[PDB]
């Protein structure tokens, strides 16, 4: 099916971007789709909650005293704000590691205002500034916890990566051979699986949170999932930072969902049971996964907000906090409005 | 499967370890001097905002404005009228020099400042807290041309940028005439520099650039020319001789035009349009035309990195230049996919297929898409 977000200058088509989306229930049954909802998709940072699970399920990790903020950073593509780097350093301290132990590299900040601040001060970002720094410290913590040694914690043949590989396939309900692996910008293995399975991970996150809240019997696995949901909802500034879609989405909704960006314009949302989900004809939590085929971030945020509006997730009041993402500014160097965005797609049911 | 390939399948693709990351739809037209279509990718008649790729057509409207010759604009100045420049100091200085030649001030410009198209210029600006103003606009030189036009005909500099102004009437007609289109087949929006900007089928953008390179061939041959073909040959020559004014250091357009040493001109449009005018050569004759050639490209989704990759791939598929001319552009053709720890994690490939002249079954439709 033929689903585009379209940008226009004076009603004249500028760019068009192909949209894929899956809305799934708690068991990962497909409720709603755009484009191809099973598109083989690199989840990139959208997978970090599942990598966080592998760290949290590593024997001895509880001993380090990681708090909800720390777990939030494990789940983060953060903007590398001073407060992100400070929490990375404090997490290194809790496991008696140093920055030299990190196998991720510096890069320009995911926030242009942070990056401009760095440029002004001639600052060259190092390992500790990685958007992925919290995940790498988690991996160091897991490595040391089982006495596997911290050297090579990032390599596919290290037991930490064997744990991550198994945990991703389990959460997706996939055989090992159905998950493909490349290398991320931060130099860890990174999975690809059908986009609907990314929605399933986040439906299980939200369903865990629901199960915890309703005093139900839970595996250690569901209890860990609910703790990850809780940490992301509680400290959304650690997951992203000031002005970032994921932070403003999670603050607007105040514990009702979690949202996570993946690089090259993936998005995942886990939504707790609500009048909205019941309305959509499911009894449980749901998951939403989205890919912009061509990788455009600005179009991703526009489409995710349009999707929430079409699914009736939130009130119009809540969703209005995301107005500048939904209909991004199309204004020239002289303050004249030159065009906008349109959403000529229909959700299939 | 390889025998049922279609324009809808004309993609440039990025991979991580062989896994598809992003894919981008490509549209391209290759046309002769009269604008006959020789080769295509995707939909070569896609209605497309030319944006800055139309700047040579706006430069022609300025140069054919009676009295403009009086101001003493040189080749460097005309090159800046055709520019999307990086706002380097030499670009700002040249703009101020052009403002003096017409006795106008920075205050008469109706374009606004913006971040430099060059990361290196931007870094320098960030460092010194510099806020770009009108005179730094990538489009500054086009705007001074328009002012120059406005003064020469006695129209008033006030509103020179508005559709009702006779300078914008001249642009409107010149663009339709160069495209060989009725007015009603060219649509108009507003550009980032706050001028009218046209949209026409992608193949007519290639036709404009074919006419530029054709005029250059007629001039070099010492053929008698219309005022129009003489002016087009002057624009070609200005762009080819002063490619640093058209863009700047490190910019695809400058490096492409230096590499080819007068054999073609090339211009970026915002949101990933490109236009090339190729002078008659062995290459163009090999491609089955006895004159100059035009190429126009659009990435459907607007990705600029994929545009430079695709344009370089397409020059190589058309046989334009030596491998050794083209290899100044290797870093644009096959962009680096190196992670934060120096490890290559993937790259770009070009699963698209030139059509127009291998011969496929007459029953395989090639639907513009
Ligand atoms: Cl003509
Ligand atoms: Cl990378
Ligand atoms: Zn990472
Ligand atoms: Zn302009």
Residue numbers in the entry:
A (entry chain BBB): 4 to 352
B (entry chain AAA): -3 to 353, 356 to 367
Text of the article:
Rhizobium etli, a nitrogen-fixing bacterial symbiont of legume plants, encodes an essential l-asparaginase (ReAV) with no sequence homology to known enzymes with this activity. High-resolution crystal structures of ReAV show indeed a structurally distinct, dimeric enzyme, with some resemblance to glutaminases and β-lactamases. The active site of ReAV, deduced from structural comparisons and confirmed by mutagenesis experiments, contains a highly specific Zn2+ binding site without a catalytic role. There are two Ser-Lys tandems, all connected through a network of H-bonds to the Zn center, and three tightly bound water molecules near Ser48, which clearly indicate the catalytic nucleophile.
All the crystal structures reveal the presence of a zinc ion in the active site area. The zinc ion was found near helix H9 and the loop connecting strands B5–B6, with a tetrahedral coordination sphere formed by Cys135, Lys138, Cys189 and a water molecule (w1). The distance between the water molecule w1 and Zn2+ is in the range ~1.89–2.05 Å and the position of this water is the same in all structures.
